[PDB]
Design an enzyme around this catalytic site. Structure first.
Site, PDB file in Angstrom:
ATOM      1  N   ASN A 158       0.838  -1.198   0.000  1.00 56.14           N
ATOM      2  CA  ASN A 158       0.000   0.000   0.000  1.00 56.14           C
ATOM      3  C   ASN A 158       0.872   1.247   0.000  1.00 56.14           C
ATOM      4  OD1 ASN A 158      -2.828  -0.777  -0.021  1.00 56.14           O
ATOM      5  ND2 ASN A 158      -2.464  -1.669   2.005  1.00 56.14           N
ATOM      6  N   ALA A 181       8.975 -12.542  -0.226  1.00 60.42           N
ATOM      7  CA  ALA A 181       7.600 -12.856   0.146  1.00 60.42           C
ATOM      8  C   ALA A 181       7.118 -14.167  -0.462  1.00 60.42           C
ATOM      9  CB  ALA A 181       6.676 -11.719  -0.262  1.00 60.42           C
ATOM     10  N   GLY A 220     -10.230  -4.594 -10.346  1.00 55.62           N
ATOM     11  CA  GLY A 220     -11.429  -3.777 -10.274  1.00 55.62           C
ATOM     12  C   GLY A 220     -12.698  -4.607 -10.253  1.00 55.62           C
ATOM     13  N   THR A 246     -12.797  -0.684  -3.554  1.00 54.06           N
ATOM     14  CA  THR A 246     -12.409   0.601  -2.981  1.00 54.06           C
ATOM     15  C   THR A 246     -12.432   0.551  -1.457  1.00 54.06           C
ATOM     16  OG1 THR A 246     -13.312   1.795  -4.896  1.00 54.06           O
ATOM     17  CG2 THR A 246     -12.866   3.074  -2.900  1.00 54.06           C
ATOM     18  N   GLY A 247     -11.249   0.457  -0.857  1.00 54.05           N
ATOM     19  CA  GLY A 247     -11.129   0.349   0.585  1.00 54.05           C
ATOM     20  C   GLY A 247     -11.303  -1.076   1.074  1.00 54.05           C
ATOM     21  N   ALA A 248     -11.629  -1.976   0.152  1.00 44.15           N
ATOM     22  CA  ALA A 248     -11.864  -3.374   0.492  1.00 44.15           C
ATOM     23  C   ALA A 248     -10.667  -4.250   0.143  1.00 44.15           C
ATOM     24  CB  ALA A 248     -13.108  -3.881  -0.208  1.00 44.15           C
ATOM     25  N   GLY A 249      -9.528  -3.618  -0.117  1.00 44.72           N
ATOM     26  CA  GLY A 249      -8.305  -4.347  -0.393  1.00 44.72           C
ATOM     27  C   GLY A 249      -7.804  -5.033   0.860  1.00 44.72           C
ATOM     28  N   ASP A 250      -7.960  -4.353   1.990  1.00 40.36           N
ATOM     29  CA  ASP A 250      -7.562  -4.904   3.277  1.00 40.36           C
ATOM     30  C   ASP A 250      -8.447  -6.086   3.650  1.00 40.36           C
ATOM     31  OD1 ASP A 250      -5.620  -2.939   3.439  1.00 40.36           O
ATOM     32  OD2 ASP A 250      -6.855  -1.590   4.660  1.00 40.36           O
ATOM     33  N   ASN A 280     -12.404 -12.436  -2.519  1.00 43.71           N
ATOM     34  CA  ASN A 280     -13.380 -11.684  -3.295  1.00 43.71           C
ATOM     35  C   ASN A 280     -14.660 -11.484  -2.494  1.00 43.71           C
ATOM     36  OD1 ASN A 280     -11.704 -11.447  -5.566  1.00 43.71           O
ATOM     37  ND2 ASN A 280     -12.444 -13.372  -6.451  1.00 43.71           N
TER      38      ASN A 280
END
Ligand code: NA
Lengths: 291, 307
Positions: A158, A181, A220, A246-250, A280
């Site tokens: 991020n 990683a 997306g 949007t903001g739901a990547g975490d 998802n």
């Protein structure tokens, strides 16, 4: 118990305008967001890192405990202060946010802040932890120790040029983390930013020598691109193409890590596919709550 | 028509708890509180200082203009942040303040920010302004310039060791300003710390050789002790409903300095005694609403409380 995901980095208090002359206290910070996401799936999540010995730091300690995230290894710096964001409104009411504390306490993560790791555990890291010292060197040490004891490391860059005192060291420092990683989560533009040929193709083809066991790319609405050195696959959210993250990547990461951590063999292609399915799921779940 | 009062230092946005999950966005900071308290008493106050170019600093510029302090000499630092203080509660068992921004923009007060001073004017300074360079030297330079021109200097050692990058420098740096002022406001524990004494009488004999025109020591709820080179007197006060002590001391200074600023000669004994009486009134009144400025009274309200 045995299954566990360790999370580290910046615990952040967001201050949102609650109309006029009032701010709403909202717990945030990507590592804490993922930590809470996992615990909400009834998963075992623990957080280690550094906040300030201040009310905002105590807010995060309380919040995480309430969300059943283990924060026994959360430290309170007597001098430095907890990261605090204030979002602001335009003439047109369009959001803008300002970092209030720079550098914040999380950037002073020490070697003695690092807890004992056990075989089969996970460690998740964001790029903000790699911005400055001693956090940069402390975090890489945490990575090395997790692997040495037979644990696994995931990474989600991020990236924000802001927090870095030396922005030039970014491309090299983050790509360094990518190399160490087990799992790397890339946004579409994020994969690109490290010299993208406008396509996710050679942008992918580049990282090939890193031989990352698992690479996941958000798309997306197209869902999620899943990459293994052997295969190549897209796992859509099989529902008339839902929405973005949007903001739901975490939340996405949390769902992914929770399932990979409880797996007998997370290396399994079938296990990975199911994990992305949950990822998802969490991602869509977060964006249906008006967020 | 009467004496203008200059104020300098840290303009601070205070975040005060409203319930369990909300904060009150309140304007604060010693120079801003006193500047506003003077203006609300129909007095003439101006502000020179430095805030962040951030919107928290735009918020303080707006609050000062509305109140209505002159802030032509208010500057915006394009790098550092406006001071943000989060007040919580402190078990054992009162309030607690915490400085989130170190160092804030006001610590970078420059020589170029200092306005022209005039004979008869006043300058009030909080000890936070002496914490770090270049504010320390800038503030010391401004204090001297006011003295040279025939103005007067007010000083409140509002101690907060947190903002000092070299806390060991505090006592010597503060006591330097004490010996340069005409008026000094002490807490009972402040005077003790700075003098290494235990009793108020001893702390006074310690600083007695500075020959300060006016020394005020707040006796908490019994009012204040008023000290002058010749005489000492006690000036009583009345009690209210404490629901937010935030900036009560800055309100005290507000009432004290206004009453002095309108006198032809503030050195007059009766004038001094009446000014502390005003100070006790404004101090208690500010502790009746949440926020430092929110309950700062006009003349009508203050006369009504004293009468
Ligand atoms: Na108050």
């Amino acid at each position: 118990s045995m299954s566990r995901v360790w999370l580290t980095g910046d615990a952040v208090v967001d201050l949102i305008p609650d109309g006029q002359q009032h701010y709403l206290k909202c717990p945030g910070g990507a590592p804490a967001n993922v930590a809470v996401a996992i615990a909400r799936l009834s998963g075992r999540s623990a957080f280690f890192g550094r906040v300030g010995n201040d009310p905002f730091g105590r807010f995060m300690q309380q919040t995480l405990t309430d969300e059943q995230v283990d924060c026994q290894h959360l430290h309170f710096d007597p001098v430095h202060r907890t990261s605090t964001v204030v979002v602001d409104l335009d003439e047109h009411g369009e959001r803008s946010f300002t970092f209030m504390v720079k550098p914040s306490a999380d950037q002073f993560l020490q070697l003695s802040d690092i807890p004992s790791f056990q075989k089969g555990e996970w460690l998740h890291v964001c790029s903000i932890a790699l911005a400055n010292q001693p956090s940069r060197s402390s975090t890489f040490a945490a990575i090395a120790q997790m692997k040495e004891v037979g644990g696994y490391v995931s990474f989600d860059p991020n990236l924000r040029e802001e927090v870095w005192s030396e922005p030039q060291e970014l491309q090299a420092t983050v790509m360094r983390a990518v190399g160490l990683a087990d799992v790397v989560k890339f946004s579409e533009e994020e994969l690109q930013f490290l010299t993208g040929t406008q396509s996710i193709e050679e942008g992918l083809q580049a990282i090939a020598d890193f031989q990352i066991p698992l690479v996941v790319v958000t798309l997306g609405a197209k869902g999620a691109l899943v990459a293994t050195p052997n295969s190549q696959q897209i796992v859509s959210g099989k529902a008339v193409k839902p929405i973005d993250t949007t903001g739901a990547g975490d939340a996405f990461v949390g769902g992914l890590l929770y399932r990979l951590s409880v797996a007998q063999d997370w290396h399994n292609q079938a296990t990975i596919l199911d994990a992305v399915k949950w990822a998802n799921g969490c991602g869509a779940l977060a964006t249906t709550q008006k967020g």
